[PDB]
Amino acid sequence: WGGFSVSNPTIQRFFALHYLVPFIIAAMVIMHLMALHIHGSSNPLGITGNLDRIP
Amino acid sequence: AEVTQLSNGIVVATEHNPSAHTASVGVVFGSGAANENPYNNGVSNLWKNIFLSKENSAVAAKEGLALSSNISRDFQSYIVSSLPGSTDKSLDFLNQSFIQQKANLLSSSNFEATKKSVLKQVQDFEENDHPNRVLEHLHSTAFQNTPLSLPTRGTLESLENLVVADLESFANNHFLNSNAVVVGTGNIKHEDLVNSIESKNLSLQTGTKPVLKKKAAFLGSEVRLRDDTLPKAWISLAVEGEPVNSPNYFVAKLAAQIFGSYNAFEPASRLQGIKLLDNIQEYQLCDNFNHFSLSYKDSGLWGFSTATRNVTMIDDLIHFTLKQWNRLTISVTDTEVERAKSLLKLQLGQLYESGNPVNDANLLGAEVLIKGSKLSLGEAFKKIDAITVKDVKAWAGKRLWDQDIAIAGTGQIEGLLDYMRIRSDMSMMRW
Ligand code: HEM
The missing domain is CATH 3.30.830.10 (Metalloenzyme, LuxS/M16 peptidase-like)
Known part of the structure; x- marks a missing residue:
């Protein structure tokens, strides 16, 4: 809170943390795409896809 | 090059060369692999190997003659080679195997020996000659369902259904006087080829x-x-x-x-x-x-x-x-x-x-x-x-x-x- 209730310090620190966390999400999206690249996507049949690929 | 049509409708073409030590006389027809249907595909490849069979080549070799044949998409050829001065001997051989006597080459013993030889060549072509079978598949996918897509050797599935009555039907429709050119190259001049053809009167029907x-x-x-x-x-x-x-x-x-x-x-x-x-x-x-x-x-x-x-x-x-x-x-x-x-x-x-x-x-x-x-x-x-x-x-x-x-x-x-x-x-x- 920065005090005894939800007050002026609570709102001023909630806005500064709101500016920052979308940039942490953007860094975790890059780490998400790096793990996707080493194995590729799945397919709705659940079997291997290495026999028939298109770019 | 001199071209001359005779009185009975035969076209003669000659390219004389006095500095050659051989001469070649043959017949070229204007039908190839693009004049067949998907059922008799391969009858031109079978007619070539009947001409080059062993009993035909042994008769020509006793006179000092060599035989050649070529099947393409638009034409076929049957050529006899000799020395310059044996050119009337190679005309008598070409007479006795296209005009006067053709039923002794299509006997049942000679046909089945020839058919199993061609079936071995097409099977060896399909498993071993990779730059040439890719170019034949390019013709069959670019001109598909049109006469220009059939392979010149035939297919392995179409060749096993051919009998001796298929070869006689193809010859009666395509080996005609209005579809043929008599050629001559090497040490042979135009007037001795024309006078030698005109000496044999050659009825030659008008299909x-x-x-x-x-x-x-x-x-x-x-x-x-x-x-x-x-x-x-x-x-x-x-x-x-x-x-x-x-x-x-x-x-x-x-x-x-x-x-x-x-x-x-x-x-x-x-x-x-x-x-x-x-x-x-x-x-x-x-x-x-x-x-x-x-x-x-x-x-x-x-x-x-x-x-x-x-x-x-x-x-x-x-x-x-x-x-x-x-x-x-x-x-x-x-x-x-x-x-x-x-x-x-x-x-x-x-x-x-x-x-x-x-x-x-x-x-x-x-x-x-x-x-x-x-x-x-x-x-x-x-x-x-x-x-x-x-x-x-x-x-x-x-x-x-x-x-x-x-x-x-x-x-x-x-x-x-x-x-x-x-x-x-x-x-x-x-x-
Ligand atoms: C901002 C958030 C996210 C972004 C930009 C994102 C992006 C992507 C992309 C582009 C793919 C590529 C293949 C596809 O579209 O299926 C993918 C696959 C995948 N994602 Fe996400 N994703 C996000 C959130 C999530 C969440 C919340 C989960 C799970 C709790 C998740 C799990 C997966 C899985 C398991 C795959 C692989 C699916 C497959 O290959 O069949 N992702 N993601």
């Missing part, structure tokens, strides 16, 4: 070849024959080209000479004046390539073939080649046209002036069947010398810029991409 229903048409398509147990990848790719009797016949031949042939293991072929060789020699993208321009009676093909072991960089070899074809429309230079003029005159000077009278008899007879005469080599050289840079850019903007292609491939061709990323390289996005 006419059957006409085809379907006209040949090009279709953009592809066929893939993947085989991961083979060491290389073999690919052919083409657009629709020029027929015989086209006004752009020599312009299409000069455009293929600009890109030419290549062998990666010959030191002098790596030094040629071709701008494509700068791109492909850095990472060694291929083993060999060659550019062609094939022309038939109805249509044609223009493209290239290749073979490589760099199976992980196939998409760079196709991309670099098609980006050089784009330059014929926008930015082809003057030195490239003058270099290709000199190399084209050397190429077809070695084709029409070899020392083989069997090769000259095939080229002479195939041309009189289509045009009625033969163009001289001196007049073909003046047509090549009058081609400009504007003639090349006008031809390539009509035939190559943003056009449909046909692809065929075998071997380790996993790295060859889809139709639509190869089709989109036929324009540049720049202009």
Whole structure:
């Protein structure tokens, strides 16, 4: 809170943390795409896809 | 070259050469593999091996005569060779196997021995000759459901159903007087050939070849024959080209000479004046390539073939080649046209002036069947010398810029991409 209730310090620190966390999400999206690249996507049949690929 | 029609309707053509030590006499017919249907495909390949059978070749060898035969898509030939002074002996042999007596070659003992020999050749061709069976699959996917897609050797499934009554039916419709040209090359003069033919009176009935229903048409398509147990990848790719009797016949031949042939293991072929060789020699993208321009009676093909072991960089070899074809429309230079003029005159000077009278008899007879005469080599050289840079850019903007292609491939061709990323390289996005 920065005090005894939800007050002026609570709102001023909630806005500064709101500016920052979308940039942490953007860094975790890059780490998400790096793990996707080493194995590729799945397919709705659940079997291997290495026999028939298109770019 | 002298052409003369006789009183009974036989066309005689002769190219005399007094500095040759042999002579060749033969008959060329104007029906090939493109005059069959999918059921009797292979009857021309069977008629060739009946002519070259052992009991026929033993009769000719006692007189000092040699036999040859050639099956193509538009013509067939049956040629006898001898010494210059035995030319009436080779006319009597050709008389007794096409006119007066043909039922002794089609006996049941000779037919079944010949049929199992041809079945062994086509089976060996399909499993061992990979650059040549890819080019035959390119004809069958570019001209599909049209007479120009049948293979000249026949297929293995169609050859096993042929009997002796199929060969007699094909001969009665196509081996006619109005479909034939009698040729002669080497040390033989025109008047002794005409007087020797006129001495035997030769009734020679007045039939006419059957006409085809379907006209040949090009279709953009592809066929893939993947085989991961083979060491290389073999690919052919083409657009629709020029027929015989086209006004752009020599312009299409000069455009293929600009890109030419290549062998990666010959030191002098790596030094040629071709701008494509700068791109492909850095990472060694291929083993060999060659550019062609094939022309038939109805249509044609223009493209290239290749073979490589760099199976992980196939998409760079196709991309670099098609980006050089784009330059014929926008930015082809003057030195490239003058270099290709000199190399084209050397190429077809070695084709029409070899020392083989069997090769000259095939080229002479195939041309009189289509045009009625033969163009001289001196007049073909003046047509090549009058081609400009504007003639090349006008031809390539009509035939190559943003056009449909046909692809065929075998071997380790996993790295060859889809139709639509190869089709989109036929324009540049720049202009
Ligand atoms: C901002 C958030 C996210 C972004 C930009 C994102 C992006 C992507 C992309 C582009 C793919 C590629 C293949 C596809 O579209 O299926 C993918 C796959 C995948 N994502 Fe996400 N994703 C996000 C959130 C999530 C969440 C919340 C989960 C799970 C709790 C998740 C789990 C997965 C999985 C398991 C796959 C693989 C699916 C497959 O290959 O069948 N992702 N993601």
